[PDB]
């Protein structure tokens, strides 16, 4: 039962399992780091044990399937969106032809977490807060793809390995700078993170949709959000900062350093930058970021076609 093809198959399977486990544990450690900065592994073990052994109480007047289904979406959507990220040569889960399209599919499915949580939580204020949160994330998902499309236009493909190999000389943060800032804004807004933290806080008619979620469902929401930051940072690295490419260090060391830097940058962005109003946020999205992405794609295409002799 020994064959090198099978050895390659189980080796790639082990690589994918290791990537998955590192992503979940790294999101949990991000939860610890945000809780501490604003042993520790033993504290997270204690917290996880408490979520295990606390009773899980679904409300009597709530739909059980939707209520249970929303935390699975909030976890699995971006945790499966990580699967296209190449962390090292020979260390990618899937070398998809669609790639960044698969990230867009996972974000489009990810909006159902907030929608389903707000509907199943039988409360009018929670429902209105969920409508506000879903309107916000749709208002920023409307330009997430085009801010990505500048980079896709430069690389000429949707494959992440091809994007990284196209960043071999110059990293994409220099030409696709406006794509970079719009992608950072939209990736923060998709994960419902600061300054897009609580759209329900602008009105006493609205409450959080994480309310009435207790135990492992609340833990799933928390760890899914932190995993979302992890994969948004990793996609930002692979799309705009050369991925694993660096001068002297091993490639995974460079990728991990850039991902950790962007994770801590999102931490200080939460800690420092204040919260705008709801109408200000939606107006900023629809009126600034989408035209900026469209003009960025047009200018990128003109530059590409000009420099083709």
């Amino acid at each position: 039962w020994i064959s090198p093809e099978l050895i390659e198959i189980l080796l790639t399977i082990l690589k994918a399992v290791v990537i998955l486990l590192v992503v979940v544990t790294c999101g949990a450690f991000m939860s610890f780091g945000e809780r501490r900065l604003l042993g520790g592994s033993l504290q997270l073990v204690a917290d996880m044990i408490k979520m295990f052994f606390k009773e899980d109480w679904i409300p009597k007047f709530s739909d059980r399937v939707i209520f249970t289904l929303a935390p699975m979406i909030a976890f699995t959507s971006l945790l499966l969106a990580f699967a296209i990220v190449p962390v090292s040569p020979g260390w990618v889960v899937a070398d998809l032809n669609i790639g960044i399209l698969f990230f867009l599919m996972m974000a489009g499915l990810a909006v159902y977490a907030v929608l389903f949580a707000g509907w199943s939580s039988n409360n009018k204020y929670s429902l209105l807060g969920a409508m506000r949160a879903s309107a916000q994330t749709l208002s920023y998902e409307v330009f997430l793809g085009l801010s990505l499309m500048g980079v896709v236009a430069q690389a000429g493909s949707f494959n992440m390995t091809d994007i990284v190999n196209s960043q071999a000389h110059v990293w994409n943060v220099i030409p696709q700078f406006f794509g970079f800032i719009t992608f950072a804004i939209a990736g923060v807004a998709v994960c419902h993170r600061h300054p897009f933290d609580q759209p329900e806080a602008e009105q006493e008619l609205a409450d959080g949709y994480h309310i009435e979620y207790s135990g492992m469902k609340f833990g799933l929401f928390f760890v899914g959000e932190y995993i979302g930051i992890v994969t948004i940072s990793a996609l930002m690295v692979t799309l705009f900062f050369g991925g694993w490419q660096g001068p002297l260090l091993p490639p995974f060391i460079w990728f991990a350093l850039k991902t950790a830097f962007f994770m801590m940058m999102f931490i200080l962005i939460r800690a420092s930058l204040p919260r705008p109003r709801y109408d200000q946020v939606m107006s900023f999205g629809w009126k600034i970021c989408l035209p900026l992405t469209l003009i960025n794609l047009l200018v990128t295409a003109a530059v590409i076609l000009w420099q083709a002799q």
Binding site: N97, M105, L138, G145
Partner: protein
């Protein structure tokens, strides 16, 4: 790539069958999302990678979101139709079921007897679809932009509150 097609097609058929015979709107939309995921799996099994990507991105990820938005906004809590449940009464559904079954047998009889060497499953990339889209189908792109513009104007004129 054949197993994936057959299981995804069976899942899609079962999902829409549970869509049309369900009473809760959010449950029906959930089964509709499951059907769209299965149909995108069918697309990926055939090599239409761009089609499956757009099926999850747009159909299961934008239009179904609009449906869920409308459902949670109108707040359907059993407005005299859930408590009535007329579509599961045999005298209501038996007629259209036989009519649709007759149409299905006629269409399926037309499908069979056609020459068929099989779908190869070779991937048709988003590259080639983009080349065709902005090559021989330029006017389709511009007039589809005008079509979506018309839908935007109509839906704004009707659906705003005032």
């Amino acid at each position: 790539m054949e197993f994936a097609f057959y299981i995804c097609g069976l899942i899609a058929i079962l999902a829409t069958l549970r869509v049309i015979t369900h009473t809760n709107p959010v449950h029906a939309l959930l089964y509709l999302i499951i059907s769209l995921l299965a149909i995108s799996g069918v697309f990926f099994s055939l090599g239409a990678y761009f089609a499956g990507a757009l099926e999850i991105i747009v159909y299961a990820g934008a239009i179904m979101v609009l449906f869920v938005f409308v459902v949670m906004m109108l707040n359907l809590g059993g407005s005299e139709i859930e408590q009535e449940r007329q579509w599961l009464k045999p005298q209501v559904w038996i007629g259209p079921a036989i009519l649709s079954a007759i149409m299905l047998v006629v269409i399926v009889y037309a499908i069979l007897g056609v020459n068929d060497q099989g779908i190869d499953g070779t991937p048709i990339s988003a590259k080639a679809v983009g080349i065709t889209l902005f090559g021989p189908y330029v006017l389709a792109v511009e007039l589809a932009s005008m079509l979506l513009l018309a839908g935007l104007v109509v839906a704004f004129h009707v659906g705003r509150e005032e």
